[PDB]
Design a protein around this ligand. Structure first.
Ligand SMILES: OCN(O)CCCc1ccccc1
Ligand code: NI
Length: 166
């Protein structure tokens, strides 16, 4: 199933996700629906918080062919280094992109779709995506790193877009 993605300025996007208690069939259905939603909306990442599911679940696919599914359940940041920044987008902030500070490399541990623990060292786009998605789980958005003026402009553009959509 495809889920609706919350758009700013929805306060539900500020909710802090709780850890997944057990990776079972219910959680796996959520993961699959999140991937379907992410692909349908042409994104490279999606956090459960964005679909009003407040649990630490993240789906990602940074591959060129869009056929490399990465699942991060209960992700934990183990180490990070350097700094970088690219113009990030977000399905909750439709059609708007802005550069924000991020660590260049990160090492995390999490559970996969089967509930199996794994460690992952990432850099480049994947590292940035992981940080972006983990921010969602603690109620943070990329626009939060921008100036009040930049934020206001983004806010108005998204509201205008949804206005037209409706
Ligand atoms: O929450 C993510 N999402 O809605 C899709 C896009 C995520 C993303 C796009 C560009 C650079 C970093 C992260
Ligand atoms: Ni996002």
């Amino acid at each position: 199933s495809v889920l609706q993605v919350l758009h700013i300025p929805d306060e539900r996007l500020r909710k802090v996700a709780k850890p997944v208690e057990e990776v079972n069939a219910e959680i796996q259905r959520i993961v699959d629906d999140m991937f379907e939603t992410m692909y349908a909306e042409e994104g490279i990442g999606l956090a459960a918080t964005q679909v009003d599911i407040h649990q630490r679940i993240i789906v990602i696919d940074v591959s060129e062919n869009r056929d490399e599914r990465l699942v991060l359940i209960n992700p934990e940041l183990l180490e990070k280094s350097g700094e970088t920044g690219i113009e990030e987008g977000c399905l909750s902030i439709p059609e708007q992109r802005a550069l924000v500070p991020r660590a260049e490399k990160v090492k995390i541990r999490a559970l996969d779709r089967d509930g199996k623990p794994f460690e992952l060292e990432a850099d480049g786009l994947l590292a940035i995506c992981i940080q972006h998605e983990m921010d969602h789980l603690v109620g943070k958005l990329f626009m939060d790193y921008l100036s009040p003026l930049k934020q206001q402009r983004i806010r108005q553009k998204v509201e205008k877009l949804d206005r037209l959509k409706a």
